[PDB]
């Protein structure tokens, strides 16, 4: 994989956009405001372990990583031609939309008045999590979990065990080399057990940011006036290997409390990217 | 405090000190 | 629109200020302080939905966005001319005004020690959001909202329902490209329901950041000697299309809170801008 | 005012020194520390409205704005000389003084274990206030109020009334253009009521920062290794007019309160200046 | 040791990966999920003094120092020539991997609603600490303890006594340069007793930062697209003295806290290095 | 005082070590860990004042400046000769030793859990300061209290009324100019009281940050890849005038409070300074 000069002339610069919707757990059908649909971009109420060895949490309780394979122009006439050309994503301007809604303090959550059930709607608060990737191949995961003993369901969501077709191991709660995956589907990966893999990730370019608490005031910036260079040490950005180009995200905003019983739903919102890409000569 | 943010979340945007203006303006005319 | 030159010659170069007052949710006028006008500046008391399907938040309770178009001097003769002159936006100096007055905490609010109502006069506290745009065109916005099931009046404001003349969706709780408007009025368009849309807005510069949470800090600066470059990545600015200059913001402080059942009330502040224009040949 | 070049020679560059003692609304005298003065540095107890249409604040519960106007060395025989030279406000490192002495809780206020009147003196904590402009006349201000009705006394203070001879407006409550004064007097101009006005300040430079909250950690750093420039984007500082430099600031460090009904009592601290001045040839 | 030229050539530049798993306080084995391998990534419940005078933690319960010693290829055929070669660390791209899995709460720990044992399962919180050094030797520690009269287990773990054969003195609590060690055992060295020692580490590079409090929320970073430069300030970086390369760091999150009796349990996570290295000529 | 080129030659560079013990309160010695030896590092017991003029604070209980005057290699045969060599610090590399240390919350410090005696042992929190001076004479001290009618000891603390001989005044509770001292013995000026004076320090570079509170978390980074730079606008460092390089420093990490009455104790950790110096010739 050689890599050459920037291709010249007419089309050799493209610009690529996309919103990736959140992925909390209520999935986006059915659409009925009265049926589940209403739960749509946060996630269903999260149900706690029952004791230190019976913890299963529902799909739609997790919130799982966004992705999309975006189909870029087509390139090369001769495939054995010494010489090919390939699409690199030199940059991307990206952006969390919608942080404004979180101002909605007139809803029926808790109460910040709870004696006389009064006062505001609790806005939404907590655990954020906001991470985004974008590369020319699906962006490789390392699982990691809380608790190797986590009963995921073995349907409707990819783990460890999808994985390794094993039971997780103690390993799983620290770096366990085996249990890695690929973000190949859209709502199905648990952010709570895959984490960008440091180890690969060569041709993806990624930035996450945690913050915990239970509590913890949601912060949010978003201008159209930011670029993130997506170029390496060398100058060259990641390469779209088959003309797909990977976008992935999660962008957890916290949770939202109801009145019964201080039940959690988590709050994601849609991201948007703006990739610009340009043909780049390939020996 | 205690809650930071500094890669997915959309980042900070800067301004220019006014008596640096010209510079970062002569390089864009 | 092929971008040329910049003018030069005498009043080539202008400059143009602005302050706009905020929309919290109280009207302008009245103005007698016994009749509505002293909550000029602030929301009406946020009123909570009564339950989980009734949610019916007044007008005034609900912050809007903030607008001015401003008329810059005319410029073309010839409109049939192969070259004509357009005012660009440089940059600006913005401002948000009047932080200090947060300072008086001897008012009548819900007061810091409720067992004996002493202390001092809780001041303004809570979420914040500040976002300003300077553009050639209205602002384009994209709506997403807490829950598609709120029920906004009809009349007094615009929400998603006035755009597209139906009912909110389930998808409008997270990216709906179809709930899109143009801010072209000033206190009409409520922040919670619409966001500055990032897959447009290629005429205009917009830059906003939220904090979360019930009892956060305000938090602020300012200083007359920051001036933000509206210029993009090829040295242009917002060009003003028909020599109208258009200023957006929402600069919401957090809330007040009153001494009964906890009533909330926004508080925003006005925003100053002061833009530098100057002119471009174009083609 | 046509600026033109720097004037070079014997004297043409000069440094000056001043410090702003607070203005928290316990004047300088009496000095007795049992007759008041033991108070100087901090306000007297925030006294609270007695209901929504009564908040009659003392002025000497008021923090106010500090402000000096110092004489620079003469400069013009001739003043009908085509060109006269004026002194020119370059740069000024300037720091605030104390902050150590927050770190005495051996005091009696209120204690951190309120059921047993033990732990420590609560340390002085909440809103934060910094403001320092230095400039060539006075700092222009825009008058903007939390309430139009709050009932400042008639003598003692500079309030919007003192200035348009009639009673504030609901307009007072955001933005109104009438609402204008000069810093021309210290420790007379509530900060709660005042504030740098941006449309104006063409030849001062201010810079201020806003933490609100209740019980905020005050914050503050101090070296003196650093150095504000002064001079705008055409490379010139503030000019001073008739050769007064005059230097504006406001220093809350929060509020300490008693063991008794928590009275508060706001924080203030010196602020000291050190600016340097050249002289300018000015046509 | 005089620092000559850097090498170049075929294979002058190499690139050494590893991740280190957390050493919190529970070892790798027993890997069974029930026999205290389900706590391996978090140390065991801290157990606290039973007086003044009585404070003996358990080795399972302080999380110690993660190091490694990578081995680099072979470089001097003549150990007697004038002029050998030496691998130097040039960079390091690190990364703590998991902060996502910090978003399970949905296990059975303290919940947030504990009057009706409701809510979420509290996420882990608390005083975080991440140090990383990269070096060509081991890392030099300075011992420093909270109390010079704890306890500490004489079997187990690597303390000030272990070095000393003598028990700690009341210096041990402030900077006593007789209490010095070197990371060279993973899993022994006590974070809260050895500290990055700055009067040595000539030849590693370390980076550190501590948060502390008891529900401070844990905020992490992660991207791959970050490098730490090693070279000083003469352009060399730490220099591979036996051609070992040694690596070390911990990073804590904060606790978990169990349903009983608040027990702590403290949480690590893996650190991911990626060094580059490069032949110098050394004389 | 004319500052002329820097000696080149053999020896015209040096560095000079040394770290800095915090000065809590309770003195190096005793050192028997029953006889209050196991204090060192901290405060005695805070003691509070008993009505509002009664405030008397033990001296072990009043965190104190720490500093150390070092001797640089002699320079000058001739002192009659035109021009003589001075000891220029051109920079330091500083750091603030064992934050590590406040991982420990195994003690017996108030616990977490005060209703059942569990949870962990709270660690260090509140208000910190940090500051640090390196300079050529005594760091110039401005004294500035909270309240001028503390009665501090007269012996074994340097405080105002030991330099004017006098009792402090109200004008003490805000900038005095009379009330000046130099840091010229360690452990006896108490920082809650002596303040770096801007007004001075012409030959001393310090830099300090106050953060108040009374549960904030400790944070602290340390790294040995920094350096801080000590020349002035003009490339000049503080100059060491007898040869003595003056070090001074305050590390106040917060407080550990006991089980009894919320006793706080201030808990200090040690600095280290590496001091690059080179010779300068000088008129």
Redesign the interface.
């Known amino acids: 994989m050689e890599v050459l000069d920037l291709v010249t002339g007419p089309d050799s610069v493209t610009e690529i956009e996309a919103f990736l919707n959140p992925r909390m757990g209520q999935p986006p059908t059915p659409e009925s405001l009265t049926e589940g649909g209403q739960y749509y971009g946060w996630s269903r109420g999260i149900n706690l372990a029952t004791s230190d060895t019976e913890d299963s949490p529902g799909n739609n309780t997790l919130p799982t990583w966004s992705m999309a394979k975006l189909q870029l122009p087509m390139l090369n006439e001769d495939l054995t031609c010494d010489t090919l050309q390939m699409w690199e994503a030199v940059s991307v301007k990206?952006?969390?939309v919608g942080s404004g809604s979180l101002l909605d303090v007139h809803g029926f959550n808790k109460p910040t008045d709870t004696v006389n059930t009064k006062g505001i709607s609790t806005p939404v608060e907590g655990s954020?999590?906001?991470?985004?990737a974008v590369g020319g191949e699906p962006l490789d995961l390392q699982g990691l979990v809380t608790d190797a003993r986590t009963k995921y369901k073995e349907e409707g969501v990819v783990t460890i065990k999808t994985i390794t077709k094993k039971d997780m191991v103690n390993k799983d709660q620290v770096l366990n080399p085996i249990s890695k995956a690929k973000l190949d589907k859209d709502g199905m990966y648990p952010v709570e057990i895959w984490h960008p893999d440091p180890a690969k990730n060569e041709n993806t370019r990624y930035?996450?940011?945690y913050?915990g608490?239970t509590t913890?005031?949601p912060?949010?910036?978003?201008?159209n006036?930011?670029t993130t260079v997506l170029l390496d040490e060398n100058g060259v950005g990641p390469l779209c290997k088959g003309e797909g180009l990977y976008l992935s995200?999660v962008?957890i905003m916290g949770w939202r409390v109801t009145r019964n019983y201080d039940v959690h739903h988590w709050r994601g919102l849609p991201r948007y990217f703006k990739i610009t890409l340009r043909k780049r000569w390939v020996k | 405090?205690?809650?930071?943010?500094?890669?997915?979340?959309?980042?900070?945007?800067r301004?220019?000190?006014?008596?640096?203006?010209?510079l970062?303006?002569g390089?864009?005319?």
């Not at chain 1, 912060?219 to 201008?223: C, E, G, I, K």
């Open positions: 990206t952006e969390v954020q999590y906001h991470v985004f930035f996450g940011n913050t608490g913890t005031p912060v949010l910036q978003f201008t006036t930011l995200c962008d | 405090g205690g809650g930071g943010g500094g890669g997915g979340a959309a980042s900070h945007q301004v220019t000190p006014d008596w640096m203006l010209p970062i303006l390089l864009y005319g």
